[PDB]
UniProtKB/Swiss-Prot annotation, chain A:
Name by which UniProt lists this protein: F-box/LRR-repeat MAX2 homolog
Organism: Oryza sativa subsp. japonica (Rice)
Subcellular location: Nucleus
Organism classification: Eukaryota, Viridiplantae, Streptophyta, Embryophyta, Tracheophyta
Key word Repeat present: yes
Subunit-structure text: Associates to a SCF (SKP1-CUL1-F-box protein) E3 ubiquitin-protein ligase complex. Interacts with D14 in a strigolactone-dependent manner. Interacts with SKP1, SKP5 and SKP20.
From Swiss-Prot, chain B:
This protein's name: SKP1-like protein 1A
Protein location: Nucleus; Cytoplasm, Cytoskeleton, Spindle; Cytoplasm, Cytoskeleton, Phragmoplast
Tissue spec. comment: Accumulates only in meristematic cells. Expressed in inflorescence, shoot and root apical meristems, as well as in developing organs such as gametocytes and seeds. Also detected in cortical layer and epidermis of roots, leaves, pith and vascular bundle of young stem, young floral buds and organ primordia, pollen and through the valve of siliques. Not detectable in mature root tissues.
Biological process, per Gene Ontology: auxin-activated signaling pathway; chromosome segregation; ethylene-activated signaling pathway; jasmonic acid mediated signaling pathway; microtubule cytoskeleton organization; negative regulation of DNA recombination; protein ubiquitination; response to auxin
GO cellular component: cytosol; mitochondrion; nucleus; phragmoplast; SCF ubiquitin ligase complex; spindle
Keyword annotations of the record: Auxin signaling pathway, Chromosome partition, Cytoplasm, Cytoskeleton, Developmental protein, Ethylene signaling pathway, Host-virus interaction, Nucleus, Ubl conjugation pathway
Entry's family note: Belongs to the SKP1 family.
Phylogenetic classification of the source organism: Eukaryota, Viridiplantae, Streptophyta, Embryophyta, Tracheophyta
Keyword Chloroplast: no
Ranges where the record places region Interaction with the F-box domain of F-box proteins: 48-106
Pathway(s) per entry: Protein modification; protein ubiquitination
Span of the signal peptide: none
Subunit note: Part of a SCF E3 ubiquitin ligase complex composed of SKP1, CUL1, RBX1 (RBX1A or RBX1B) and F-box proteins.
Main location (coarse class): nucleus
Length: 581, 106
């Protein structure tokens, strides 16, 4: 064996490049030596099954990953249950053991993702990794236990983990109050923090100005901040110009800033943004995704280009007058690689032509709800940006219909890697790897293969999100043409037993997809439940290895394994607010 | 040749271990795509050994990356046949590995 003749360090080096989880698992089964090579070089693990069981606890000393940096415990069984909680003295003894075993298997964790139902989970795990742990992601879709003190959920992390730099509460439901008290009362931990995602499971009315102020003030070392904010000027505690300038002076190191308003003029003026960008020279990544409008925004965009030369990724919602060709506004930001524009009501073809010349480095372009842009605008842009433009998003633009939009993007059909469109019905896509499709309820998929998108030789993932006749089907079977289509997100959560007819409408013909490997399915809502016809149709997907339903099934989960020949990864993941038991 | 500084085992020298077949290809690499890796298996592993010995980090990264893709998407039996590996496990210690793997999501 020429591979096994190599010095062991080099076999390890080979294995360090193999990122596919299944391939790693097969390599480990090859020989005892590659087993050693795989275990010693695996960088990340998402833990499958129940670590409480003796089956995990009494695994070999060989089940060890000395170089594992990212451990994901958030997906352990049963999904979303308390892990290592305390809610008598007998239980702390068994919790200590389970924790110590995880430390044994994974001694070097620097990035942890966990389902944190209450602080005691973190209090149990963290002592074992407190010296090494730099990033912590919290996951909780269940309601915040009402009996907890403010900031109790983050208490164990800010006390113990002296290496902590990154905190990812994007999918962690708690109250904004919890985040404020915690981050304002642990200065020794909080002054070190560089990354902060405060999404709070997207179930918050946004952070208020008197909440954003003290968090930023307590974190002088922030470089990335992602946060929902209350931008609504009907309320006096909303994030305005003052909250922005304070954010910039409190965090003068911010390179990535992504603020969005949870779905009239905003309390944010152009002059306040000029002042804001003036204080943030090292800004590379800027998102302001608002429901309320920022009017005549071009001068602030020019100030952005002037004051923040590093600016690469721009996403703006409800910004008006971002570019008008009488180079103007956004078209002066030559450094841009990514431009996304939601609800720009005065963005014209002339604007896209001006963005085409000005923003030469653009690889990702997006317009959402810009109702003055035509096929001509898109045609010119896709043509001008041909050497670079690889990702396109066109959503809910009134004058832009799917058929003419796909023809407009033809200048780059052979180059485009990622597409996102909403379907509206009034040659090879050579590089198209990823597709996102948005539908109205009762709208057909079938005419998509006629409107363009006939052949997609490298398309491996499709995403379908929905925002009616007796025998008509949505027509997933029309994706059987796409030869390497393996992953699918079918999101019907916002589409609407009574639901059995809608589930059947959408899911019918899913069996046709010969090469479907991974399926993420979201059933329609009113405790979201799959109906039997939906179960019957997903059963017929013989190609499935991974199946994740978001909601529940009273139909035995064991039926799926006995149906689907090669199903391995299967879970019901109620990853929405608020989760049941 | 000049190009020599890409080998750390030369920048530290301010080669009786590598044959001319491999040294010429090491040299032809350092003229500074992946069609250079259209090489056979025997000389690929000789190129890995040379890249490490000569301490060319860039060459070593690419050559080992090629071997990773060679393992990727292959069943255990197919990995064994690709690299002429003898199956070193007892039925008991193989089902140990197979059981261990089930604790990680694919």
């Amino acid at each position: 064996s020429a591979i096994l003749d190599l010095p062991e360090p080099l076999l390890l080096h080979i294995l360090s490049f193999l990122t596919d989880v299944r391939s790693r698992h097969r390599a480990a089964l090859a020989c005892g030596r590659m087993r050693a090579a795989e275990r010693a070089t695996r960088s990340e693990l998402s833990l499958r099954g129940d670590p409480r069981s003796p089956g995990f606890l009494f695994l070999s000393h060989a089940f060890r990953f000395p170089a594992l940096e990212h451990l994901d415990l958030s997906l352990v069984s049963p999904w979303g249950h308390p892990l290592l909680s305390s809610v008598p003295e007998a239980i702390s003894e068994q919790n200590a053991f389970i924790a110590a075993r995880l430390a044994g298997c994974f001694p070097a964790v620097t990035s942890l993702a966990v389902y944190c139902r209450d602080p005691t989970t973190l209090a149990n795990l963290t002592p074992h990794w407190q010296a090494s742990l730099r990033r912590v992601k919290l996951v909780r879709w269940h309601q915040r236990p009402p009996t907890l003190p403010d900031g109790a959920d983050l208490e164990p992390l800010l006390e113990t983990c002296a290496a902590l730099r990154e905190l990812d509460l994007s999918e962690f439901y708690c109250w904004t109050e919890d985040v404020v008290r915690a981050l304002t009362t642990h200065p020794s931990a909080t002054a070190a923090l560089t990354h902060l995602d405060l999404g709070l499971a997207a179930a918050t009315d946004g952070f208020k100005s008197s909440e954003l102020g003290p968090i930023a003030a307590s974190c002088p070392n922030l470089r990335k901040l992602v946060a929902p904010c209350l931008f609504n000027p009907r309320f006096s505690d909303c994030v305005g110009d003052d909250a922005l300038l304070s954010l910039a002076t409190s965090c003068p190191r911010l390179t990535v800033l992504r603020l969005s308003e949870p779905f009239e003029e905003a309390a944010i003026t152009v002059a306040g943004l000029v002042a804001f960008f003036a204080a943030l020279p090292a800004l590379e990544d800027f998102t302001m995704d608002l429901q309320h409008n920022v009017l005549e925004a071009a001068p602030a965009m020019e100030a952005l280009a002037r004051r923040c030369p590093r600016i690469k990724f721009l996403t703006l919602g409800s910004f008006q007058g971002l570019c008008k060709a009488s180079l103007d506004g956004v078209a002066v930001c030559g450094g841009l690689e990514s431009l996304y524009m939601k609800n720009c009501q005065d963005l014209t073809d002339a604007s896209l032509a001006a963005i085409g010349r000005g923003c030469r480095r653009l690889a990702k372009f997006g317009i959402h709800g810009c109702d003055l842009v035509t096929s001509a605008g898109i045609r010119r842009l896709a043509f001008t940006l041909r050497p670079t433009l690889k990702e396109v998003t066109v959503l809910h633009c009134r004058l832009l219909h799917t058929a003419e939009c796909l023809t407009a993007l033809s200048p780059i059909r052979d180059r485009i890697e990622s597409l996102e469109i909403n379907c509206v019905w009034n040659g090879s896509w050579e590089m198209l790897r990823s597709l996102s499709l948005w539908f109205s309820a009762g709208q057909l998929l079938s005419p998509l293969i006629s409107a363009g998108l006939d052949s997609c030789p490298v398309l491996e993932e499709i995403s379908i999100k929905v925002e009616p006749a007796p025998r008509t089907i949505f027509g997933l079977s029309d994706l059987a043409g796409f030869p390497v289509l393996a992953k699918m997100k079918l999101d019907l959560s916002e589409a609407v037993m009574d639901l059995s007819l809608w589930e059947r409408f959408y899911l019918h013909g899913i069996e046709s997809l010969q090469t479907l490997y991974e399926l993420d399915y979201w059933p329609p809502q009113d405790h979201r439940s799959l109906t039997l016809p939906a179960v019957g149709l997903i059963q017929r997907c013989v190609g499935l290895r991974k199946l994740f339903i978001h909601g529940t099934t009273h139909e035995h989960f064991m039926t799926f394994f006995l149906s689907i020949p090669n199903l391995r990864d299967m879970q019901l993941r109620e990853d929405y607010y608020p989760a049941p038991e | 040749v000049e190009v020599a500084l890409e080998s750390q085992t030369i920048a530290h020298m301010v080669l009786p271990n590598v044959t001319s077949k491999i040294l010429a290809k090491v040299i032809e690499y350092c003229k500074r795509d992946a069609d250079f890796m259209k090489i056979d298996q025997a000389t690929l592993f000789e190129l890995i050994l040379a890249a490490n010995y000569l301490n060319i980090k860039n060459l070593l990264d690419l050559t080992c990356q090629t071997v990773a893709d060679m393992i990727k998407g292959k069943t255990p039996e197919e990995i064994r046949t690709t690299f002429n590996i003898k199956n070193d496990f007892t039925p008991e210690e193989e089902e140990e590995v197979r059981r261990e793997n089930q604790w990680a999501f694919e």
